[PDB]
Amino acid sequence: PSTA
Amino acid sequence: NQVLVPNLNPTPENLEVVGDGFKITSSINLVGEEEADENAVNALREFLTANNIEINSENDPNSTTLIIGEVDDDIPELDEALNGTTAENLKEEGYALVSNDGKIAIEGKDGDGTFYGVQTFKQLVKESNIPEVNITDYPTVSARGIVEGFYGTPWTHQDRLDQIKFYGENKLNTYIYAPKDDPYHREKWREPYPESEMQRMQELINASAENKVDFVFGISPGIDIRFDGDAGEEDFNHLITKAESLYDMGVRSFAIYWDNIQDKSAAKHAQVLNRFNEEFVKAKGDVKPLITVPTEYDTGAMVSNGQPRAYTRIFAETVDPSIEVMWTGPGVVTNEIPLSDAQLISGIYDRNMAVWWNYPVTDYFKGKLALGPMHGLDKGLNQYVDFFTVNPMEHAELSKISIHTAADYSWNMDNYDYDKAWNRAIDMLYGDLAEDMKVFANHSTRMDNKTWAKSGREDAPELRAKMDELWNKLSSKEDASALIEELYGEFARMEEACNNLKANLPEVALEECSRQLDELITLAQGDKASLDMIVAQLNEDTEAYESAKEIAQNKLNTALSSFAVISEKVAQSFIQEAL
Ligand SMILES: *[C@@H]1O[C@H](CO)[C@@H](O)[C@H](O)[C@H]1NC(C)=O
Numbered sequence: 308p309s310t311a
Numbered sequence: 312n313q314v315l316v317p318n319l320n321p322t323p324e325n326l327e328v329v330g331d332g333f334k335i336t337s338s339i340n341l342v343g344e345e346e347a348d349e350n351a352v353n354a355l356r357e358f359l360t361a362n363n364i365e366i367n368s369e370n371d372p373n374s375t376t377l378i379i380g381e382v383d384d385d386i387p388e389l390d391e392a393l394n395g396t397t398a399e400n401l402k403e404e405g406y407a408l409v410s411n412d413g414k415i416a417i418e419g420k421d422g423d424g425t426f427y428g429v430q431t432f433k434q435l436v437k438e439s440n441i442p443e444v445n446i447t448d449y450p451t452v453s454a455r456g457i458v459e460g461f462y463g464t465p466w467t468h469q470d471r472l473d474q475i476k477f478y479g480e481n482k483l484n485t486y487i488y489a490p491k492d493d494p495y496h497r498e499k500w501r502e503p504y505p506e507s508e509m510q511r512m513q514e515l516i517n518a519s520a521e522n523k524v525d526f527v528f529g530i531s532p533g534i535d536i537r538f539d540g541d542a543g544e545e546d547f548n549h550l551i552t553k554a555e556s557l558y559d560m561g562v563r564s565f566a567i568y569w570d571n572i573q574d575k576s577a578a579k580h581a582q583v584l585n586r587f588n589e590e591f592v593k594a595k596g597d598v599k600p601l602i603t604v605p606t607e608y609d610t611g612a613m614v615s616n617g618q619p620r621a622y623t624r625i626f627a628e629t630v631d632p633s634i635e636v637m638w639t640g641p642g643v644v645t646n647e648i649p650l651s652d653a654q655l656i657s658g659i660y661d662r663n664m665a666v667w668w669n670y671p672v673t674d675y676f677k678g679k680l681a682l683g684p685m686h687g688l689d690k691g692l693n694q695y696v697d698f699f700t701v702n703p704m705e706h707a708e709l710s711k712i713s714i715h716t717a718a719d720y721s722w723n724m725d726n727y728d729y730d731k732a733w734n735r736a737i738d739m740l741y742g743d744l745a746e747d748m749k750v751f752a753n754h755s756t757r758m759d760n761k762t763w764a765k766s767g768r769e770d771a772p773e774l775r776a777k778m779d780e781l782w783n784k785l786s787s788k789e790d791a792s793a794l795i796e797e798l799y800g801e802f803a804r805m806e807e808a809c810n811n812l813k814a815n816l817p818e819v820a821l822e823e824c825s826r827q828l829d830e831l832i833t834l835a836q837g838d839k840a841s842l843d844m845i846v847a848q849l850n851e852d853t854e855a856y857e858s859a860k861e862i863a864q865n866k867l868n869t870a871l872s873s874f875a876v877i878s879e880k881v882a883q884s885f886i887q888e889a890l
Contacts, residue, residue, distance in 0.1 A: 308462050308463060308674060308675075308677075309462055309674050309675040310462075310570075310571055310643050310675065311571070311763075
């Protein structure tokens with residue numbers, strides 16, 4: 308649900 | 312007696328008060344509307360209808376006169392009313408506005424500029440009163456707006472139409488449709504939109520045009536796109552087909568994204584952008600420059616010991632100079648973009664950069680609302696940046712606070728005062744509830760996931776300073792009863808404010824922050840008991856101490872286990888400190  | 316100049320957003324470049332102001336009459340004379348920008352006239356017509364101001368059929372010498380048009384309109388009555396002011400010498404989207412002695416004149420450098428001149432007009436009028444001013448105005452950055460590119464629940468159709476009206480009014484001219492969790496954008500990019508989705512798109516494109524917003528259609532094929540052979544051909548033709556079906560509805564801006572993917576084939580990434588730029592963007596003749604983001608898109612991921620990494624270096628070496636390239640700053644989510652950081656990245660790309668600013672987006676920390684202003688963005692960034700966009704929250708209505716300040720920052724950059732922009736944002740959006748909304752939002756500006764993501768103005772700094780001042784006064788046995796009585800007021804105010812918001816905020820705003828409002832009331836109560844603990848300890852009253860200590864722990868336990876997150880390092884930390 309996000310960037311790494 | 313005199314008509315003051317109301318809050319304006321963005322801040323106009325040049326404004327001189329040339330008179331006392333006057334009241335616009337019941338009906339007005341309208342001049343230049345046949346040759347002036349179609350959209351600007353419509354925006355002006357709507358405002359007048361809403362404010363019960365009719366338009367005369369034949370000229371009336373007693374009525375207020377309004378003249379409107381572009382530089383490239385031959386309207387002498389317009390130049391006559393501008394009083395030596397001109398839009399002729401301004402950059403694109405610029406305008407001049409003069410209002411003196413019963414006349415209002417708006418001349419835009421182009422259509423976009425005339426529209427924006429009407430937006431300022433709209434903001435200047437209050438209860439039919441207008442100040443007498445001479446204005447010339449133009450943007451610092453030519454591309455200003457929003458990239459809907461977050462993970463999580465994409466904005467509804469209704470959300471987006473309302474946003475586009477909001478951008479128009481604040482002179483933002485770019486909206487990038489790129490929601491990560493839209494299957495047809497990313498996961499299943501090859502597949503055409505269903506007919507009813509295309510009809511929703513059509514409504515968006517229309518509304519964008521009505522508000523002078525460049526609707527950028529984005530596509531993220533980087534998960535599974537093939538590059539070589541017959542497969543590469545087919546996959547490229549899928550981009551063309553997809554972009555064509557949107558061109559055919561009226562889209563004139565396009566983006567192709569490579570962010571957050573496994574495949575780091577820099578050459579083939581740019582080789583695709585270039586071919587699309589040739590066979591589509593240039594071929595069409597009326598399509599704006601192609602926008603992109605590379606797989607390496609933050610300075611940390613792009614640069615190594617002053618020198619670009621293999622991906623970045625090959626990407627810049629290959630990608631056509633006309634293509635807009637986006638980057639996020641020193642990190643994906645970072646405190647600052649200092650001037651030196653833009654210099655480096657702009658250097659590597661030998662071009663003016665585009666900014667993907669990851670704030671107020673909250674997809675990485677969904678418990679907190681990011682309600683702060685643009686912060687840490689260098690005020691001379693226009694030197695290396697000609698394209699500026701923010702990634703907003705999945706909560707559209709509350710994103711407006713942060714976006715409002717982004718409108719001011721990117722339009723009038725060197726004038727940008729973040730505290731003043733923030734205050735104005737809330738004053739303009741919240742009306743009667745502005746003072747209380749400030750109290751609440753003041754605690755919800757800083758974003759921190761404790762690991763890789765940090766950004767935004769620190770939470771309630773004045774209150775943090777008073778808290779630090781207390782511990783210093785106590786541990787060095789100084790008298791503190793003046794500060795304690797002051798802090799009781801603050802915490803009571805926090806509670807009073809949040810309760811008033813719960814009671815009076817319209818649903819569209821309340822349904823986005825109610826859990827956080829609850830969280831802050833709790834902490835304000837935990838803080839009040841924290842003070843009670845301090846007072847009782849000074850009084851050497853163990854009964855009142857233990858009683859207050861339990862209340863304080865009860866509030867802290869509620870906060871630590873609740874989904875909503877607010878004021879971590881201030882209102883929450885104070886209770887933790889007191890234990
Ligand atoms: C990764 O970072 C942000 C925050 O999670 C996310 O919204 C975005 O879609 C990703 N891409 C870029 C280019 O920031």
